[PDB]
Design a protein around this ligand. Sequence first.
Ligand SMILES: Cc1cc2nc3c(=O)[nH]c(=O)nc-3n(C[C@H](O)[C@H](O)[C@H](O)COP(=O)(O)O)c2cc1C
Ligand SMILES: Cc1cc2nc3c(=O)[nH]c(=O)nc-3n(C[C@H](O)[C@H](O)[C@H](O)COP(=O)(O)O)c2cc1C
Lengths: 175, 175
Amino acid sequence: GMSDTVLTGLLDTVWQQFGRGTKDRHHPARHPTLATIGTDGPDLRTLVLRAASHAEATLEFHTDAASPKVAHIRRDARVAIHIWIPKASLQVRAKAIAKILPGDPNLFAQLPEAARMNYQGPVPGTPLPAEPDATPNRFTRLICHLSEIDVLHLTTPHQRAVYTAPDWRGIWVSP
Amino acid sequence: GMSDTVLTGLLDTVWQQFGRGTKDRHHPARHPTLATIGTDGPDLRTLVLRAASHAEATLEFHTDAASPKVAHIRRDARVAIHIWIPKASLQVRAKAIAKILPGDPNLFAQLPEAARMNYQGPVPGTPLPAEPDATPNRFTRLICHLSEIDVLHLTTPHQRAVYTAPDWRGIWVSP
Ligand SMILES: Cc1cc2nc3c(=O)[nH]c(=O)nc-3n(C[C@H](O)[C@H](O)[C@H](O)COP(=O)(O)O)c2cc1C
Ligand SMILES: Cc1cc2nc3c(=O)[nH]c(=O)nc-3n(C[C@H](O)[C@H](O)[C@H](O)COP(=O)(O)O)c2cc1C
């Protein structure tokens, strides 16, 4: 139960679950919570998971360049990502560096009008009424390069493992 | 609509959902996500909501005094609390100050041994095998004094409001 194979298997399962978030609108990994260091303490919010790569150790989100979270990352790129997956009895906590890249205008062109329109409205969080900004370039990628995965497995008894770059081997820790 | 009436009702809805969270184990508000400032960037994790007071604008969690989250809060009391409630189409983000208080020893006396063990044994996060920690009085209250609530209502289209202590009146903001 404690073997290296089990640890490896548990990490593979975590990445499998991220993968399901990219494929299934109804899975909890569809909607991870991203924390940033904000202007007066930590801040967090839901995003849609767009892509995941176990090999590259990345998770990808899309966001509005004009939004506060992007300003937070510009000043401090250190982020954390969380999912609670109760049907699988798994909590996943990840530490990452968030990198900001331009969005794919081919994807932007495929977005529904409402989504397209929302990237070109007021700055998110601005008190209404407010002026819009028709800049399609607001469409932005957040590529989160994971450095740590802490996974709690709420079986009997609880088990918890932590995996850290660069080794990513995994160690059992006390819940 | 965008009336004062709708604004007031939306914050009432938030507090009713926190209420459900204390009472119903299967409700998403049972398990909100708490963000802290950690040792190297932001951190977050799931806790169990134990109590909520609309009148005092507080949320209460129980935790192990020896856990890292407590150490985080010792260095920086600013925290954020998040719940995604898909069935209500609500995301709630709350800014708070966390106070760490002793637990009620009469309640600790009344907990099952499975529950009591959440506050015994090794220091959470310690690599195994881990020595039991002998600190007295590890059963701890984490009281979050809320200062701002940012509510996103994922209607078609979305509406979003921000409410601020001590009056909690609200303003509409851009999603
Ligand atoms: C279910 C759901 C999905 C969301 N998906 C995204 C998203 O993918 N990108 C994004 O920028 N915001 C998304 N949001 C909105 C954010 O949670 C947030 O309100 C907004 O991005 C502002 O965050 P900020 O003020 O920290 O920048 C989503 C919200 C909900 C609850
Ligand atoms: C469903 C569930 C409920 C949890 N409830 C609590 C709890 O209320 N108190 C607590 O300290 N940890 C709770 N945890 C475990 C924490 O999420 C976390 O692993 C532990 O408290 C350590 O956090 P820290 O390392 O930042 O201190 C819960 C985890 C799961 C997913």
